[PDB]
Amino acid sequence: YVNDPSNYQLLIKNLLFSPVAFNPEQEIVYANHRRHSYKTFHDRVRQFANALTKMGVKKGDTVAVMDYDSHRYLECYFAIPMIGAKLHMINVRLSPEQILYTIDHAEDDIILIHEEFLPILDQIKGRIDTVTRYVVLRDDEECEYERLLEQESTEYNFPDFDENTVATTFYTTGTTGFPKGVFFTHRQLVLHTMGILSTIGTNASQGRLHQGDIYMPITPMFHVHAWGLPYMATMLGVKQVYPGKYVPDVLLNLIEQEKVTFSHCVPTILHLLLSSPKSKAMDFSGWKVVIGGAALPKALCKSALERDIDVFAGYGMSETGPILSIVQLTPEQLELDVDQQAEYRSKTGKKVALVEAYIVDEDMNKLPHDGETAGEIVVRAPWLTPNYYKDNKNSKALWRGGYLHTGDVAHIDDEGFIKITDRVKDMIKISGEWVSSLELEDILHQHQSVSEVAVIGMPHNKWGEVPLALVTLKEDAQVTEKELLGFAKDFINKGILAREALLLKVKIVDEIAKTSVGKVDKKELRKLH
């Protein structure tokens, strides 16, 4: 690559080595396991670069990671892209068959896998062709990653290349035949960091991330860069605490003992934290959770506001950076009582800097922002995936009409608040994972005696939504719900179906509502059953 130093490229190395602030004695904490300053973190990143170079990782290679939220994942967020390689983040919560498919599709060269994820590998390790090396990670001195790092020097000259080289990739299981691969460049990640820092750092007094915070993620960190927050924290040079496996009690202990002030999670985790008996004698009045999983319910928001938690909601998705919207309260709205506060904080929010976010109908006609008309959201931003990896038709359907199609139906108020009414599909979302209703319909239709199977979604608190199934039996056929539940469970036991179908809650009916054309009225069915 011809440098031309006057021509500046936006790279992740500039994010690490040209931060907003850098205190060499600020800490990085891995829960009750490890602690080390920022200087040793930089040294470790350089050592990891040396180790990867020794392993034979070139500028076009892919390194896949499968582990929990820890300092090692933070080191991988930086070392692998800075060498010019591609970081493939594996969703450990997918079924083994889907995990194997994503590994084969991405063509990973090296795999860094945690010890306790080894069983999942053991039932797919035979069918993996591209992988040359496995590095097994442990939480003790026995870790292979740690032994690899300590054989290397803390010196390394990181290359400079084009800012449009791909940095990260991960696979979204949004309803389709197979998982789809998204990817982002160095430029896009740097611009996402800068834009969101501009948006949420400049807020007057509420819901701001600044250089005095202490950050602890509660998002799995293989889900779209942990909403980009680990990159931002490193940019601000703040104390970072990584909990590892999510356990409510140890999480609360970390919050108390480390004085965490900024976190992000999904509604289920927040509900679990609030329902824990250990969370009654704690001081929560310094904490700034961002809820972005799905549809922060107003009841949970009110329950959190009485604990003195600055809870606000945000909107994004796998294809969008992810962050697209955040709720910011004006100083007049900061003095409303708890009910109106809960109503405002549970909206999807206003769009962030450099985002367009129109609302459109099926003919690509921009609807008015009158506050009640609904349509699909279409966006333009500096950090959107241009297409799906190794895909053409779905890529064209993603960017139809010159805009990125989110797949969510919402209405936009006069001041700019966005409220998502539904999806453009009849799909379910159990907790933070995607599950397809059509696939469950087919699996249940493969039963011995089934007339019509239609799967709809019903709301929930510990899960957000449950995949209700409605089955009509054949002539003189009588099978209990246990039979069909076990039949569906058998598929999950083979690694075909994700574990989120373990609470399917099937229901036997005899009449199926159908439209004038005859299509199953899933909205009417939801209002019925």
Binding site: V247, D249, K462, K482, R499, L502
Partner: protein, 75 residues
């Protein structure tokens, strides 16, 4: 085969822990390391072996063996 023995053996079979080593105060998540999801198929078999129906509100209340034992013996 009393209620407590049956409950403990369900817990051991589900979570893989030996029934002889199960304790009355063991917590599904913290002690036995059961994932929130695993604890749900757990409640499923409790009902299956006691031919009952556990309402959701109570299903969230059980987090230790003791809980389940009390709920079952009480019905």
């Amino acid at each position: 085969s009393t209620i407590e023995e049956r409950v403990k053996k369900i817990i051991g079979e589900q979570l893989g822990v030996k029934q002889e080593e199960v304790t009355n105060n063991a917590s599904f998540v913290e002690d036995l390391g059961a994932d929130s999801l695993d604890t749900v198929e757990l409640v499923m078999a409790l009902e299956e072996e006691f031919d009952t129906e556990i309402p959701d509100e109570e299903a969230e209340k059980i987090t230790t063996v003791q809980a389940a034992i009390d709920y079952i013996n009480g019905h």
